[PDB]
Amino acid sequence: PISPIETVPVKLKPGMDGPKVKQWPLTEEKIKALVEICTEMEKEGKISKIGPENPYNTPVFAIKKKWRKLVDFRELNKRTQDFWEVQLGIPHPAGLKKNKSVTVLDVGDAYFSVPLDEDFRKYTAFTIPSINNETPGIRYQYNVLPQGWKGSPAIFQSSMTKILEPFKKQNPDIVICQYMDDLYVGSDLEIGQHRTKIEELRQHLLRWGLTTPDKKHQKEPPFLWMGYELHPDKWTVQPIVLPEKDSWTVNDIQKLVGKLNWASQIYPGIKVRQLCKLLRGTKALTEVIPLTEEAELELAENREILKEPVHGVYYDPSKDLIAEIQKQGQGQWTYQIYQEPFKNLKTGKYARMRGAHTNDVKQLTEAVQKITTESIVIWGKTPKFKLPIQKETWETWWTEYWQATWIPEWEFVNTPPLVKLWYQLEKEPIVGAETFYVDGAANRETKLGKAGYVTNKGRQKVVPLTNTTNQKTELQAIYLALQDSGLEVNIVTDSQYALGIIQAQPDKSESELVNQIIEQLIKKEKVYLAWVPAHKGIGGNEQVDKLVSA
Amino acid sequence: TVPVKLKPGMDGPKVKQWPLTEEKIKALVEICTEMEKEGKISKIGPENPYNTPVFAIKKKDSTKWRKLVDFRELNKRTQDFWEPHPAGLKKNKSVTVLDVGDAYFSVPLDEDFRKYTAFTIPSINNETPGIRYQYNVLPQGWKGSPAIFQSSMTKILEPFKKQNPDIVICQYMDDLYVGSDLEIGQHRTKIEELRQHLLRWGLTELHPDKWTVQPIVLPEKDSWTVNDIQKLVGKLNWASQIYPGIKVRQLCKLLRGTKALTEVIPLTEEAELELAENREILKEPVHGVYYDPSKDLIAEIQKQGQGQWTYQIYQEPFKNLKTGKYARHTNDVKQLTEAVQKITTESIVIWGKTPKFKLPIQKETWETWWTEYWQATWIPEWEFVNTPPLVKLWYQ
Numbered sequence: 043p044i045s046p047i048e049t050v051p052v053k054l055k056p057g058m059d060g061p062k063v064k065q066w067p068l069t070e071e072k073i074k075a076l077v078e079i080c081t082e083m084e085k086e087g088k089i090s091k092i093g094p095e096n097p098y099n100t101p102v103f104a105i106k107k108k109w110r111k112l113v114d115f116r117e118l119n120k121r122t123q124d125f126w127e128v129q130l131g132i133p134h135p136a137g138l139k140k141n142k143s144v145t146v147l148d149v150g151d152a153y154f155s156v157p158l159d160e161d162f163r164k165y166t167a168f169t170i171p172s173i174n175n176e177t178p179g180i181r182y183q184y185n186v187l188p189q190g191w192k193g194s195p196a197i198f199q200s201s202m203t204k205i206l207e208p209f210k211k212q213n214p215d216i217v218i219c220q221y222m223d224d225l226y227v228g229s230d231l232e233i234g235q236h237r238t239k240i241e242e243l244r245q246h247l248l249r250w251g252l253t254t255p256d257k258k259h260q261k262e263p264p265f266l267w268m269g270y271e272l273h274p275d276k277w278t279v280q281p282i283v284l285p286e287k288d289s290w291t292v293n294d295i296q297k298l299v300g301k302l303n304w305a306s307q308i309y310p311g312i313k314v315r316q317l318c319k320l321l322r323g324t325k326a327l328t329e330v331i332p333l334t335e336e337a338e339l340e341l342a343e344n345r346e347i348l349k350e351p352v353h354g355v356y357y358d359p360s361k362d363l364i365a366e367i368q369k370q371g372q373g374q375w376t377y378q379i380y381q382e383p384f385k386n387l388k389t390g391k392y393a394r395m396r397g398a399h400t401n402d403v404k405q406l407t408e409a410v411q412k413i414t415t416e417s418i419v420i421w422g423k424t425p426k427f428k429l430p431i432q433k434e435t436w437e438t439w440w441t442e443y444w445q446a447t448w449i450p451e452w453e454f455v456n457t458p459p460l461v462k463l464w465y466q467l468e469k470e471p472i473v474g475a476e477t478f479y480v481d482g483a484a485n486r487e488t489k490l491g492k493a494g495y496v497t498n499k500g501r502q503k504v505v506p507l508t509n510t511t512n513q514k515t516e517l518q519a520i521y522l523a524l525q526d527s528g529l530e531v532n533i534v535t536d537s538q539y540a541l542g543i544i545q546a547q548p549d550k551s552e553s554e555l556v557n558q559i560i561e562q563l564i565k566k567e568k569v570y571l572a573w574v575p576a577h578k579g580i581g582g583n584e585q586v587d588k589l590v591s592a
Numbered sequence: 593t594v595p596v597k598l599k600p601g602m603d604g605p606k607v608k609q610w611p612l613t614e615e616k617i618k619a620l621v622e623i624c625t626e627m628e629k630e631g632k633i634s635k636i637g638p639e640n641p642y643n644t645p646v647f648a649i650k651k652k653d654s655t656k657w658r659k660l661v662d663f664r665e666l667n668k669r670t671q672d673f674w675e676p677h678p679a680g681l682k683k684n685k686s687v688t689v690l691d692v693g694d695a696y697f698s699v700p701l702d703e704d705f706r707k708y709t710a711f712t713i714p715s716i717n718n719e720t721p722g723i724r725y726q727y728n729v730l731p732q733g734w735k736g737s738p739a740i741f742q743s744s745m746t747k748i749l750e751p752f753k754k755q756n757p758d759i760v761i762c763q764y765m766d767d768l769y770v771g772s773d774l775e776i777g778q779h780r781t782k783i784e785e786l787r788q789h790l791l792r793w794g795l796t797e798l799h800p801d802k803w804t805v806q807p808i809v810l811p812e813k814d815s816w817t818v819n820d821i822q823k824l825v826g827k828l829n830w831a832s833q834i835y836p837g838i839k840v841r842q843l844c845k846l847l848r849g850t851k852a853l854t855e856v857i858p859l860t861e862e863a864e865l866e867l868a869e870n871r872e873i874l875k876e877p878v879h880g881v882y883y884d885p886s887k888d889l890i891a892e893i894q895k896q897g898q899g900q901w902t903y904q905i906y907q908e909p910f911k912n913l914k915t916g917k918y919a920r921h922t923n924d925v926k927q928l929t930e931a932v933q934k935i936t937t938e939s940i941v942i943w944g945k946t947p948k949f950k951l952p953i954q955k956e957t958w959e960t961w962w963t964e965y966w967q968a969t970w971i972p973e974w975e976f977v978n979t980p981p982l983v984k985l986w987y988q
């Protein structure tokens with residue numbers, strides 16, 4: 043069954059002509075099988091015979107499915123126009139609404155039941171070769187959407203939108219979701235009045251030449267879809283199986299990490315950081331990685347979580363969404379979204395920026411923006427947040443910090459570990475405390491740095507450093523100043539780089555030298571830090587500059 | 593219809609639709625259904641690969657939703673077509689800004705160019721496919737529209753302009769900038785006369801002379817510490833990269849020696865002589881900085897805390913064409929968004945074009961929240977500075 047729809051006009055890419063690919067010679071076994079199929083396809087009206095006037099040709103093959111024809115449209119696809127993105131995203135189950143009855147209508151022969159544009163049909167020409175290339179081969183062209191052509195998925199999906207437009211307008215109560223070939227139809231009508239409206243839609247599908255499974259459907263709830271299990275009043279991921287291994291290859295760990303990540307959208311508190319660390323470096327796919335004591339402990343915690351099957355609920359438009367985030371350590375965060383306390387719609391997780399220096403207050407904000415965007419996409423609205431940070435802690439951060447930063451309606455929730463800043467740099471220079479003028483130099487050719495300080499109380503130090511840079515020496519000088527100073531201290535650097543790092547109050551870093559300076563900053567009672575421009579005859583900076591210059 | 597062509601080699605825009613809230617998708621469907629009935633926009637099939645973004649906003653002090661198509665990418669790829677601004681406009685006492693975007697809907701758009709104006713209303717959770725539309729009329733927010741319409745706009749104002757040869761009228765995007773040296777009540781009456789001229793072709797206050805530099809002010813203390821001088825030297829040091837006459841050789845002599853930060857340091861006769869010399873050079877303008885129309889305007893903004901923001905417009909760095917402030921609740925993005933619009937508004941009145949903002953905020957946060965406080969018919973180019981400057985102190 044073809045279909046009486048208006049065709050979508052199609053063009054080739056500007057400048058380009060259609061495909062003129064040579065037909066490779068085939069065995070007699072393949073040629074025979076292709077004739078049998080193309081006769082069947084011709085009788086059903088999918089293809090049509092043509093003469094040798096049509097100058098275009100796309101090759102054809104035959105494989106053992108039972109023979110199944112196979113056209114290679116690689117060349118036509120290049121020359122065919124670009125089309126509109128079939129999907130800007132796939133729906134998440136948590137964004138779906140609860141329905142009484144749910145039915146899955148599979149269109150089946152989807153692409154083959156929609157007409158191809160009259161003016162484009164000529165380009166879909168292919169040839170069945172003769173026996174060892176004796177006579178001219180039989181020539182066909184498509185009157186419908188071929189399999190594997192660039193514009194089939196777009197053109198089919200537009201036809202469905204058109205075909206439903208009358209039915210959706212006439213039946214605003216029921217809801218039909220389009221995915222590829224399938225139509226998922228749901229309603230809050232009775233099992234009698236639902237089954238009738240299914241047959242109206244199945245009849246409506248037939249009115250525009252689309253077949254569909256009868257009352258003896260192929261599937262019924264719960265459905266398996268995109269790696270989910272969709273029940274009528276709940277959802278969950280499909281059965282996760284974390285394998286048992288003596289030895290783990292990379293390939294096994296990647297699939298493990300993937301499955302754990304997949305699970306994380308309903309199973310709360312899944313962690314994958316220690317497993318992911320192992321994947322750093324190269325090795326092959328079959329190279330065995332012995333698991334660290336952390337990764338063994340991490341994988342053990344995931345097995346525990348997955349033991350008891352957890353399910354997600356559906357969206358109620360009337361009620362508010364409540365997002366709620368926890369801290370797991372090593373810059374790992376987990377969240378849950380619900381509407382009625384602890385009946386989760388979904389869960390998830392946020393991972394630290396593997397790069398740069400940061401703190402908990404920054405991370406919590408980055409995790410809010412992730413979760414906010416997720417909610418705009420899934421539910422069309424921002425959820426109300428419940429965070430482990432005092433309003434006094436957040437107030438102290440946003441007012442002082444250089445970036446613009448904002449988080450919507452939120453409340454404190456006392457769930458340790460709680461987010462805090464672990465130190466504060468002084469507003470004004472400390473009286474009765476030493477003043478360490480610091481600088482770092484480094485030779486560009488030899489990579490031989492010197493780092494050190496000079497103080498108001500006389501003192502000096504100059505440490506030599508191998509295989510380093512100007513940046514690393516100026517951080518090393520600030521570290522030195524903290525080491526040889528008391529509980530209070532003043533520090534004068536000429537490194538905007540180090541000011542910029544340290545003023546932003548990191549409590550965590552990749553650079554180990556920065557982790558040392560952080561450790562110092564937390565011990566101290568009071569630290570003050572100021573900047574001067576280098577090479578200006580500024581006292582203290584001028585002295586220490588010459589110590590390191592040698 | 594006037595025929596329109598893209599730059600040679602450049603294909604049309606293919607920008608992704610930013611996800612929208614429930615209220616905005618519903619508001620956009622109300623709007624886009626009426627525009628379809630009135631012929632302004634038509635549905636489109638999947639043969640159109642092109643796409644421009646779209647969101648809903650509310651114009652200055654209004655409750656009704658208004659459509660805002662983000663034609664920045666299409667504008668970039670069309671500028672051979674469109675690309676003078678009157679220098680007198682910035683020297684007016686009062687400048688009023690009138691939205692004349694509804695004028696464009698009467699004129700039809702070239703049938704062949706209609707493909708490039710495609711846009712998508714996205715659905716929540718992608719449950720339905722996106723509602724696609726292309727423009728049949730000159731669209732609002734496309735720079736081609738005022739250019740095409742300019743011949744018609746000159747004709748509408750030809751009476752009013754002959755009537756009042758002192759009134760400077762200028763046009764950028766969908767707005768009309770009307771400036772005069774008149775009294776504000778007299779001015780307002782000329783604006784009301786102008787509304788009436790526009791009413792016959794389908795059409796239903798800032799003070800540029802009062803914009804002055806926010807100079808790099810230096811402190812004034814009763815006594816000075818080492819730290820206070822060290823910061824003061826840095827401010828002048830950095831200011832000397834912009835300003836020609838700056839020097840601080842006598843100042844740095846006061847610091848010579850490894851002194852503590854809180855130790856007090858008396859100023860010499862030459863130091864206060866040099867310090868005053870700096871002040872008065874910094875109060876007055878920058879020599880040798882002029883607007884080049886070929887090169888881009890840039891805008892940097894710094895957060896000062898307590899609802900205070902500072903900004904600088906320039907073309908070549910450390911050569912400021914304009915500096916300024918923005919003041920006045922606890923939302924940072926809101927205020928930054930209110931600042932961005934204000935700065936652009938000025939830039940359009942002075943040079944006739946918008947600046948590229950260097951916004952001090954994470955891309956994602958801004959991208960999410962900017963439309964919730966945006967009110968203008970235009971949108972400028974932005975990039976995101978995630979580097980923490982020391983410049984916060986220099987413009988305080």
Ligand SMILES: CO[P@](=O)(c1cc(C)cc(CCC#N)c1)c1c(C(N)=O)[nH]c2ccc(Cl)cc12
Pocket residue numbers: 133134135138139140141144145146217218219226227228229263265266267272273274275356719
């Ligand atoms: C009527 O089906 P839906 O459109 C639907 C949506 C998606 C993204 C996937 C599926 C897959 C079904 C299979 N296999 C159904 C739907 C919705 C909805 N869109 O509101 N709500 C539901 C509740 C339970 C179930 Cl099993 C399905 C749905």
